[PDB]
Amino acid sequence: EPEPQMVLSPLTSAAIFLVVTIDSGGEDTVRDLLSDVASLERAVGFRAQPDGRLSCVTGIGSEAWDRLFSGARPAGLHPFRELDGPVHRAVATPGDLLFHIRASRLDLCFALATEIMGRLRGAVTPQDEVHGFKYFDERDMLGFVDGTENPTGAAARRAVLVGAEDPAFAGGSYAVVQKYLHDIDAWEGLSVEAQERVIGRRKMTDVELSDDVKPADSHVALTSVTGPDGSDLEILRDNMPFGSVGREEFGTYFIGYARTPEVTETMLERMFLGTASAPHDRILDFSTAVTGSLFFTPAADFLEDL
Amino acid sequence: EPEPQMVLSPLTSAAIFLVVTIDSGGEDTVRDLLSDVASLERAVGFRAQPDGRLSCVTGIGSEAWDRLFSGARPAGLHPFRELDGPVHRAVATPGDLLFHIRASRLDLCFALATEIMGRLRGAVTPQDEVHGFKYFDERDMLGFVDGTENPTGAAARRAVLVGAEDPAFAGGSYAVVQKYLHDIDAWEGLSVEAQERVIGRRKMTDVELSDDVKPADSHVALTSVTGPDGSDLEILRDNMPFGSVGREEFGTYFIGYARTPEVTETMLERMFLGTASAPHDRILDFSTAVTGSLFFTPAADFLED
Amino acid sequence: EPEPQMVLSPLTSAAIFLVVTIDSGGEDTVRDLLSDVASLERAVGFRAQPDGRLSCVTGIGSEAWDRLFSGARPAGLHPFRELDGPVHRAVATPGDLLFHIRASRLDLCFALATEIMGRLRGAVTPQDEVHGFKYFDERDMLGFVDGTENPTGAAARRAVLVGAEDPAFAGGSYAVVQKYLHDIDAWEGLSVEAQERVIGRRKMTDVELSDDVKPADSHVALTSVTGPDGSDLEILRDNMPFGSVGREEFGTYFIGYARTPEVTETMLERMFLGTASAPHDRILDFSTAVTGSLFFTPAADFLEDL
Amino acid sequence: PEPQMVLSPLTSAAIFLVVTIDSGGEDTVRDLLSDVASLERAVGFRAQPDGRLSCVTGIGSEAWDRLFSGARPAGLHPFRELDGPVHRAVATPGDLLFHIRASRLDLCFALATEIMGRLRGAVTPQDEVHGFKYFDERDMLGFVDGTENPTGAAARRAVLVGAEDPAFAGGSYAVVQKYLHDIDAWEGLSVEAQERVIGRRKMTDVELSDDVKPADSHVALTSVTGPDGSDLEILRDNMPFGSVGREEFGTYFIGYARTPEVTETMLERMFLGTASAPHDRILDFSTAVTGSLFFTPAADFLEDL
Amino acid sequence: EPEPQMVLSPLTSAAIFLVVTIDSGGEDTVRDLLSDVASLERAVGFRAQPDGRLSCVTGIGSEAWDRLFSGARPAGLHPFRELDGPVHRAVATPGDLLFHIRASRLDLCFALATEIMGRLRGAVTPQDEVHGFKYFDERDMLGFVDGTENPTGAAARRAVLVGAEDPAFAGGSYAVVQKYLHDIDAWEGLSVEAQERVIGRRKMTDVELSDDVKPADSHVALTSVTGPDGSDLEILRDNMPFGSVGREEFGTYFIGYARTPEVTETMLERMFLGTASAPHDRILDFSTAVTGSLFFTPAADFLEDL
Amino acid sequence: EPEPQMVLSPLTSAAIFLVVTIDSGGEDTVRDLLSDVASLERAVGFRAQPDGRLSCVTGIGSEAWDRLFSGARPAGLHPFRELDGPVHRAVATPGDLLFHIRASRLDLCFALATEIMGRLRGAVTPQDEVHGFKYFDERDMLGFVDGTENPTGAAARRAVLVGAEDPAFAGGSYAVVQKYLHDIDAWEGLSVEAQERVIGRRKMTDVELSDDVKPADSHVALTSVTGPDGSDLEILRDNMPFGSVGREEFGTYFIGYARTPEVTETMLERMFLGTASAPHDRILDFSTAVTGSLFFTPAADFLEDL
Ligand code: HEM
Ligand code: HEM
Ligand code: HEM
Ligand code: HEM
Ligand SMILES: [Mg+2]
């Protein structure tokens, strides 16, 4: 093997998502930070073992990749593709670097973020900063259990990590982020039965709706895709609520990892553009994307060796 | 008689501080919410037992008190007094209601805050909202253990709850809030030994500096008051770090409860204005107050009506 | 002076309810056991400190009281009063002794029950034995949060413990038990909104329905009683699910403690017999009582001194 | 080739459900089997990572033949009755086994509910046992139960079908027996005597040395070596159960192995005895009232229907 | 009350017992430390709350009391009395100060002990230091559950704290310590039934032997003493195993608190000297006392103010 | 194939290190115990699942190897080599057997140590016995976080276990032990800044000093070693504080596992003998080694077959 980053992390209940762009002349400061980021993860986290579960995953955008490195590029790396649907729009916003920081406690996330941004002061410009918190029974902002169908164990390794198909970058992965804001008033206006039809599962028991009854414009319907293999195509998600009550913001921060962006991008097309039999994913009638960025999260050794 | 609000809460690691002003004509919506706030605390919290440790303490400002109620006022209740020191200034900022929401997990805090602000949409205007997190070994944003000398058990009851001296409002308390922002670059410029001289305790072990060596302008020096009888005057604090890395904000949200504001106010005068033998509290050379508000947190039964 | 039994126990996640009758000639064996029950609680429980939270509360029925003791009777003690409603019937079934055993683990409950029934074989006849468990996030078999409005701290002391009004028995309490079996098929036939109208609170969030909307034949409506005082009358409940999937039994084991049975019994009248404006508690359309018994749970010192 | 969760962590609660398939039920059963994996997730996922909910599904000999056609697991047959001179191991009906385990009973019960929900109509319950860990992994005879089970790779190799039956690799063979103990009789023995029945020390759980351990002790008769001299091992997860009302005290026995030959050798030695032992002394205080054998297929066999 | 020291501590699983004598001239250093010991307890412990449960109880001997303070003496304070029995001897060994430090983790105990001995370097001479650990189910070194019959709640307050009978020192208590070493080879030579006869309870289940079968020279027999009222006299114990495998030392560190030493001393006479009906406590045939000291543990305010 | 001993343990907060020598004639008794030591680990530890985390690692010295075993020797096994530096000295002390016993509680360690020494009483002579405890945030006796840079997962498998380079003993490891006693007075005389320069990392935050500020005589500097390969050479440490406040002993018990002793021995030469640009490791100016032994810890299978 090479060591991948902590893409397959345990259940964690807090996160910080940090997206930044690299200023003019920043490339050197950044390259230094990248070579140390693994050891900052350990500095902050080691002393909080073992309940801490602190991990930071670092990702790099398509344009940033070319400023920072020469040598070949990961096969799949490109700017996030805007999707201008008949009704709904998946936007593209700027981002050169992603830090996806996760732990059991927000303060650990904050301490690591402090250390990282400390080393980058001068060189970067923050584009997004989100402090996320999982609800107490793995629920998201819509009140549904979120994560149930994520792959685990060897299936997750298979779905998420670059392998032999791009051997130079094996152990890497492709992360897509989108920040969503929900219209909770609208959403709470539906009966539970109606909400279950939007999602495709039971609210309370989290059991899948039977095929004979699950709508084709339900979220679970549109994000189940079968490959040429006959194999189901899987991504790894770690959606996190965030918000502010004073400013009436209630959000879900989407992040999905896959071994090639083609998978993540297909699901997005289905959601925003629709299919043969579905105008668009009903979940977008209550959720607006306000960011969109795609990153490559290299193998851990790649970063070590600079 | 009285059940007080959850002023003496267990150690909790997350908080939301929500400060609002009441719009014109809002008084009725507010009065309804106050009668229900206890049962929202239970709705949201009960099912997360026993890890949850969700509590909300509700406080009311001096001007708001007059809008909402007639009858007596709590004897100590007045607007926060600005302190214009030689060097440092304690500001006074607007606030009619305080919700001091605490739990072991932030999401519980957020769920209760959602429900409360849900019932108040229309009637109020948010002034401040802070999501706080205690660092993993009870440390604050300056890296010091924060809370060590708070009173506990019976001493805390004695220090924090209104009693026979204002018997109409026994079970209540007086909360003072100040939001502080720190100059971290400045602070991290000091050696540990120097920082210990600012605070008055050892950084790593949290042992008090001995009397013979503790500076008189150290924080612990200026916030130790004895009353007339020689007995120490205590408050109960629950300071919480908060911040944002992107915008370089690193903060401590101060809240102190006391059975009369006279105590909290004296410590503040000493800090901002100085004494005989100290220009001001050295901690203010790294910490700037950008809010200041005083609230009365009534006994729980008072709100039930 | 007087030390009550562990009526105000912490949240515990397992229970055994044991109801027995005293055979002819059994009175002596029983009286010995009552003086020892506290020390068996310690024997079993002490070694599993402090996670264990094992408590046994012992209660005695009205006719059994006369067989066991002469001297004064607790003022409120009588046989459970059958309620023959127009539609629903609260039955009264035999029971001389109650052991309400609670802990964080079932095995501790079982161990204590073993020791107690060990000393009593010969003298008693088991009438009911239920092994109960917490569901999830304090939910009951109907899927609602169960316990939310129980009194706590000082208010609970005030509501549950006999005081100056019967000074001989101060520290005691009155327990009523009813075993309920639910018609789950029927219940799952309702929409959530319909179920919420039966109970009087929201299913998922456990927020009370406003007066503006709460039905008068909702369960929360009928079990809220105000005294002549204008003050609410409260009891302390510790309902436990129990069940068997093979026999389709899904149950709620109801137990309510109060300082006088008049309170518990009023709530029951309202539920079974109805009011001005409500035929009966809608919850009984999905719940059948198959036992009913009333006991006095003396102060702990009362039992010691035998 | 992924197996079912036969190697579970230590879990403190179990439900064992044994059912028979009614005539005409075969379709409803085959549908459920393809979904049982996704119900495990639906119910269990939200209680992670304490939950440790796992369901292992097994199929009986006759039922196999009603549900599927083509080739059979090499070792799958009806449980073989044992008519010893003193003790008898009976065979009872059972077409399907759900071995449901978690850190809490309610997760077990919730999954059992959803499964039987989908099968109401097609099947008839034969046995339903709610098991609990006692204290410190002790059983109803008061001895530590589990100590010599294989772990890690030794357990993979002892319990999963491999190259010797390639079509069914990933599978295992579960034998179940419900045992009731005569506790009165058992508590009549001194501890030293009880230790001679089991073959280990009661309080410390150290093995008796070979020069003192009886040949009719349980640990003696269930230690079996192969012709190659290596130990033949199974994986057990015995659960106490009972009812104090009915003076029923039980150990529900479940033993997984890569071939039933191993499990069946141990049973023959227990019930029928050896050269130098009439029968396992533990059977003088334990009566078997069920007996069933099931094959627990690889996970992908059930998914793909 | 005035505020007592933490005599009534929860179950904790580690302890350090530190016994020292005061050197000539040391009186001043000691008086300073006593006024600060409360705040050292908080310094060390606060940051590990609430898992920590660090408590230190400070006690002062008879002769030391006279060197340190003028004013009245606690009524019960005197040197531990050697008991020279026909067979077994309870020795008396020197000690001016006792620190009984307890927590859930040894390191917290050690940190506080380091701080205390740090301030006393110069002034004192260590006599005894034991690091104790609870065996995993509250068992002691002989394999029996140890602590079961200790009083709790109000009964414990009543049994251990000085009240109106010596009003000047209300909130105080009297601690006796004895370090015992066991003859494990001998002990393991007995059957369990024989050991149960030594102690007076069942080994595994921790149930008391019935009166009609419990020997009069069993430990539980000789340490059960009834006052004039017929009511039991109780102490509060927190025995801790300690040992060293290399040197074959297996020990029990005995500590008992009582509101008057007369109770603790009665139990000791019965154990060591015997009664009309018991030669001596059979436990002493497997246990040798190698220390013996008596201390007064004042109310916490007493230490605060000087 | 082969199963190693529990070299890679979880984080554990208690340990007993027991070093013994085999007396003449003891070799049979010792061979017996080695074949059972695996099953005593389970006897003691099984019932304390899953919190217990009891593990025993057994190591054998060079000379003992020769007395105990039939055929060939681990390639790297020799006597610990004394290091006679110009200022500091790494001594070599007797030790044939090592038991490295770890768990989440000291009592489990003690119970296993008891059972082991039980079987060996007669055949061996104790040289060293240390009861270690982790400070509450992975700190050592100098107040620095200790453990931070240890390897994890596959990196640790690679750096610690013998493989195909000595195939008869693959699954084994090489342990070096050294008991160090610190001069706390001296050490606490330094400012924190000075202490950080001795170690090479920050005291409070545990972040590494940047390369242009990190002294070459700092501990972290001298124990960072690259191989001829350009790769960093790693060991796995589990240093445990220990001590006695009475006797002013404050200690760090050093144990380092590696797949060859060459690595551990290189770091020691650098520490005690110095480099191009450093006299010796500054940490030795506050730490004195009083033991030194090297052992080989065979695969689990090796011991079972005896
Ligand atoms: C806008 C906010 C979003 C929310 C609140 C959300 C929520 C959920 C929920 C509640 C489920 C069902 C339970 C589960 O299996 O996790 C789910 C499933 C899923 N979501 Fe989303 N989701 C969101 C956006 C997205 C996006 C943008 C994608 C893909 C780009 C995605 C991909 C999936 C997939 C692949 C599944 C499961 C498919 C399967 O069941 O086989 N989600 N999501
Ligand atoms: C500016 C941000 C603040 C920070 C970061 C802070 C931090 C601390 C710290 C680290 C301690 C030592 C540990 C403890 O005993 O809690 C302390 C003690 C204390 N602080 Fe503050 N503090 C702040 C503001 C205030 C204010 C405004 C007041 C009063 C109005 C106050 C009152 C006290 C008191 C009374 C003590 C203890 C007195 C005694 O030691 O007996 N603090 N504070
Ligand atoms: C009837 C109730 C049973 C009880 C209470 C019981 C209890 C125990 C206990 C206490 C041990 C020693 C500790 C351990 O290794 O787990 C043990 C070992 C064992 N039992 Fe049982 N058992 C029962 C039935 C069975 C049956 C039916 C079988 C096999 C078909 C069996 C197979 C084993 C095996 C293979 C061992 C370990 C052998 C070794 O030490 O190398 N048990 N059992
Ligand atoms: C080696 C020393 C000792 C050991 C190992 C030991 C052990 C025990 C054990 C196992 C029990 C039974 C469980 C319990 O209720 O705690 C017990 C009870 C008791 N022990 Fe000890 N003990 C020792 C010394 C003492 C001493 C020196 C005293 C008194 C001065 C004492 C006083 C008691 C009392 C008062 C009881 C319970 C009385 C009642 O049973 O109602 N112990 N001890
Ligand atoms: Mg019987």
In order, the DSSP letters of chain E are -PPP-S-SPPP-SEEEEEEEEEPTTTHHHHHHHHHHHHHHHHHHHHTTTTT---EEEEEE-HHHHHHH--SPPPTT--PPPPEE-SS-EE-----SEEEEEEESSHHHHHHHHHHHHHHHTTTEEEEEEEEEE--TTSB-TTSSB-STT---HHHHHHHHS--TTSGGGTT-EEEEEEEEEE-HHHHHTS-HHHHHHHHSB-TTT-PBPPTTTS-TTSHHHHT-EE-TTSPEE--EE--EEEEETTTTEEEEEEEEEESSHHHHHHHHHHHHH-BTTBSS-GGGGSEEE---EEEEE--HHHHHH-
Q: Is residue D3 part of a domain?
A: no
Stated length of chain F: 306
Q: Is A198 helix (H, G, I), strand (E, B) or coil?
A: helix
- Cα Rg of chain A, angstroms: 19
Q: Is residue A38 part of a domain?
A: yes
- Phi and psi at residue B56, in whole multiples of 5°? -130, 130
Take residue F43 and report the two structure tokens written for it: 């006897």
Take residue D165 and report the two structure tokens written for it: 């039956």
Query: Which helix (H) or strand (E) is F251 found in, with range?
Result: strand F249-258
- Is the shortest distance between the CB of A295 and ligand 1 below 6 Å? no
| Amino acid letter, B122 | G
Solving technique for this entry?
X-ray
Q: Is A35 helix (H, G, I), strand (E, B) or coil?
A: helix
CA-to-CA distance for E105 and E95, rounded, in angstroms? 26
Q: Where are the beta strands (DSSP E) in C134-214?
A: 173-182
Ligand 3 pocket, residues with Cβ under 6 angstroms: D 139, 141, 143-148, 177, 179, 198, 200, 218-219, 222-223, 234, 236, 238, 251, 253, 255, 263, 266-267, 282, 286
CB A58 within 8 A of CB A124: no
Nearest CB neighbour to E203, from listed D136, D192, D203: D203
CB C19 within 8 A of CB C95: yes
| Amino acid letter, E181 | L
A35 forms beta bridges with none
Q: Is D238 annotated as a binding residue?
A: yes
| The total number of structural domains that make up chain F | 1
C126 forms beta bridges with C20
CA-to-CA distance for E301 and E58, rounded, in angstroms? 12
Take residue C258 and report the two structure tokens written for it: 């109060």
CA-to-CA distance for D215 and D278, rounded, in angstroms? 10
What is the CB neighbour count within 10 angstroms for residue C278?
16
Q: Crossing angle for the helix pair C27-46 and C106-120, nearest 10 degrees?
A: 150
- Is the shortest distance between the CB of E17 and ligand 4 below 6 Å? no
What is the CB neighbour count within 10 angstroms for residue A67?
15
Take residue C16 and report the two structure tokens written for it: 């055994």
Q: Is C208 helix (H, G, I), strand (E, B) or coil?
A: strand
E69-73 long-range contacts, CB within 8 A, separation 24+: E69/E306, E72/E168, E72/E169
CA-to-CA distance for A64 and A95, rounded, in angstroms? 8
The nearest CA of chain C is from the CA of A192 a distance in Å of 7
CA-to-CA distance for C122 and D247, rounded, in angstroms? 12
CA-to-CA distance for B240 and B250, rounded, in angstroms? 11
Q: Is residue F4 part of a domain?
A: no
State the maximum Cα–Cα separation within chain D, in Å, rounded to a whole number.
58
CA-to-CA distance for D270 and D278, rounded, in angstroms? 9
CA-to-CA distance for E131 and C280, rounded, in angstroms? 65
Q: Which DSSP symbol is given to A275?
A: B
Give the angle subtended at the CA of F66 by the CAs of F65 and F67, to the nearest 5°: 95
Q: Is residue E4 part of a domain?
A: no
Breaks after residues in chain E, judged by C–N over 2.5 Å: none
What is the CB neighbour count within 10 angstroms for residue B278?
17
CB A257 within 8 A of CB A235: yes
Q: Which DSSP symbol is given to F295?
A: E
Chains in contact with D via at least 3 Cβ–Cβ pairs below 8 Å: A, C, E, F
- Phi and psi at residue F236, in whole multiples of 5°? -120, 120
Q: Which DSSP symbol is given to A2?
A: P
The alpha carbon dihedral of C216, C269, C94, C28 has a sign of positive
DSSP string, B155-218: HHHHHHS--TTSGGGTT-EEEEEEEEEE-HHHHTTS-HHHHHHHHSB-TTT-PBPPTTTS-TTS
What is the signed CA dihedral for C118, C123, C129, C133, rounded to 10 degrees? -40
Q: Is residue A161 part of a domain?
A: yes
What is the signed CA dihedral for E185, E187, E193, E198, rounded to 10 degrees? 170
CA-to-CA distance for A97 and A297, rounded, in angstroms? 10
CB D95 within 8 A of CB D19: yes
CB B63 within 8 A of CB B79: yes
Half-sphere exposure of D168 (CA within 13 A, CB side): 20
Q: Is the bond leading into C79 cis (omega within 30 degrees of zero)?
A: no
Take residue C264 and report the two structure tokens written for it: 């518990």
Task: Please choose, from the candidates D116, D114, D140, D118, the residue with its C-alpha nearest in 3D space to the C-alpha of residue D127.
Answer: D116
Report how many helices (DSSP H) and strands (DSSP E) chain A contains, helices first.
9, 14
How many Å separate Cα E221 from the centre of its chain?
20
Task: Please choose, from the candidates E206, E283, E207, the residue with its C-alpha nearest in 3D space to the C-alpha of residue E252.
Answer: E283
CA-to-CA distance for D246 and F2, rounded, in angstroms? 50
Take residue A158 and report the two structure tokens written for it: 């298979």
Looking at beta carbons, which residues of chain F come within 8 Å of B192?
Answer: 191-193, 203-204
Scanning the structure block, which residue is given the tokens 């108040």? B120
Take residue A245 and report the two structure tokens written for it: 């009550």
- Is the shortest distance between the CB of E287 and ligand 4 below 6 Å? yes
B18 forms beta bridges with B99, B129
Q: Is F272 helix (H, G, I), strand (E, B) or coil?
A: helix
CA-to-CA distance for E163 and E171, rounded, in angstroms? 7
- Phi and psi at residue D21, in whole multiples of 5°? -95, 125
Secondary structure of chain D as H, E, C letters: CCCCCCCCCCCCEEEEEEEEECCCCHHHHHHHHCCHHHHHHHHHHCCCCCCCCEEEEEECHHHHHHHCCCCCCCCCCCCCCEECCCCEECCCCCCEEEEEEECCHHHHHHHHHHHHHHHCCCEEEEEEEEEECECCCECCCCCECCCCCCCHHHHHHHHCCCCCCHHHCCCEEEEEEEEEECHHHHCCCCHHHHHHHHCECCCCCCECCCCCCCCCCHHHHCCEECCCCCEECCEECCEEEEECCCCEEEEEEEEEECCHHHHHHHHHHHHHCECCECCCHHHHCEEECCCEEEEECCHHHHHCC
Q: Is residue A29 part of a domain?
A: yes
CA-to-CA distance for B186 and B183, rounded, in angstroms? 6
Give the angle subtended at the CA of A256 by the CAs of A255 and A257, to the nearest 5°: 130
CB D31 within 8 A of CB D91: no
- Phi and psi at residue A221, in whole multiples of 5°? -60, -55
The residues whose Cβ lies within 5 A of ligand 5, an ion, are: D 184
Stated length of chain B: 305
CB-count exposure of residue A157 (10 Å: 0-12, 13-18, 19+): middle
B233-236 long-range contacts, CB within 8 A, separation 24+: B233/B263, B233/B266, B234/B150, B234/B151, B234/B155, B234/B159, B234/B263, B235/B159, B235/B160, B235/B263, B235/B264, B235/B267, B236/B7, B236/B8, B236/B150, B236/B151, B236/B156, B236/B159, B236/B160
Q: Which DSSP symbol is given to C135?
A: B
Nearest CB neighbour to A203, from listed C137, C193, C204: C204
CA-to-CA distance for B45 and B35, rounded, in angstroms? 17
Nearest CB neighbour to E191, from listed D136, D142, D190: D190
DSSP string, B263-285: HHHHHHHHHHH-BTTBSS-GGGG
The answer to whether the CB atoms of E246 and F52 lie below 8 A apart is no
CB D207 within 8 A of CB D187: no
Scanning the structure block, which residue is given the tokens 């039939």? F70
Where do the H-state alpha helices sit in chain A? 27-46, 62-68, 106-120, 153-160, 184-188, 192-199, 219-222, 261-273, 300-304
Looking at beta carbons, which residues of chain A come within 8 Å of C203?
Answer: 192, 204
- Cα Rg of chain F, angstroms: 19
CB A195 within 8 A of CB A187: yes
CB E132 within 8 A of CB E240: yes
The alpha carbon dihedral of B155, B156, B159, B165 has a sign of negative
Looking at beta carbons, which residues of chain C come within 8 Å of B46?
Answer: 138, 145, 147-148, 206
Contacts of F45 (CB under 8 A, 6+ apart): F52, F54, F55, F103, F108, F112
CB C202 within 8 A of CB C214: no
Take residue A3 and report the two structure tokens written for it: 């060591």
Domain that holds residue F298: 14-304
Half-sphere exposure of C271 (CA within 13 A, CB side): 23
Take residue A61 and report the two structure tokens written for it: 């955008």
Q: Is residue B4 part of a domain?
A: no
Task: Please choose, from the candidates A289, A281, A224, the residue with its C-alpha nearest in 3D space to the C-alpha of residue A254.
Answer: A289
E125 forms beta bridges with E21
Task: Please choose, from the candidates B214, E50, B48, D276, the residue with its C-alpha nearest in 3D space to the C-alpha of residue A137.
Answer: B48
| Amino acid letter, E238 | D
Q: Is the bond leading into E74 cis (omega within 30 degrees of zero)?
A: no
Take residue F84 and report the two structure tokens written for it: 């006679």
Stated length of chain D: 305
CA-to-CA distance for D186 and D194, rounded, in angstroms? 8
b (16+ CB within 10 A) / e for D256-280: bbbbbebbbbbbebbbbbeeebebb
| Amino acid letter, E103 | A
CA-to-CA distance for E144 and E206, rounded, in angstroms? 7
CA-to-CA distance for D286 and D249, rounded, in angstroms? 10
CB B119 within 8 A of CB B33: yes
Take residue A81 and report the two structure tokens written for it: 């593709």
CA-to-CA distance for A268 and A222, rounded, in angstroms? 9
What is the signed CA dihedral for E254, E257, E261, E265, rounded to 10 degrees? -30
The nearest CA of chain D is from the CA of F214 a distance in Å of 42
How many Å separate Cα A158 from the centre of its chain?
18
Q: Which DSSP symbol is given to A149?
A: T
CA-to-CA distance for A85 and C92, rounded, in angstroms? 67
- Is the shortest distance between the CB of B199 and ligand 2 below 6 Å? yes
CB-count exposure of residue E279 (10 Å: 0-12, 13-18, 19+): middle
What is the signed CA dihedral for D216, D222, D227, D229, rounded to 10 degrees? -100
Q: Where are the beta strands (DSSP E) in A159-248?
A: 173-182, 225-226, 232-233, 236-237, 240-244
CA-to-CA distance for F121 and F18, rounded, in angstroms? 13
A89 forms beta bridges with A84
CB D242 within 8 A of CB D200: no
CA-to-CA distance for D108 and A253, rounded, in angstroms? 33
Closest residue, chain F, to D145 (C-alpha): F47
- Phi and psi at residue D38, in whole multiples of 5°? -75, -25
| Amino acid letter, B218 | S
Query: Which helix (H) or strand (E) is A256 found in, with range?
Result: strand A249-258
Give the angle subtended at the CA of B41 by the CAs of B35 and B46, to the nearest 5°: 135
Take residue F25 and report the two structure tokens written for it: 């004639």
Among C158, C208, C239, most B C-beta atoms within 10 A, so best to mutate, is C208
Contacts of B257 (CB under 8 A, 6+ apart): B7, B160, B173, B174, B175, B235, B236, B237, B297
Q: Is residue A217 part of a domain?
A: yes
What is the signed CA dihedral for F22, F27, F33, F34, rounded to 10 degrees? 90
Closest residue, chain B, to E2 (C-alpha): B154
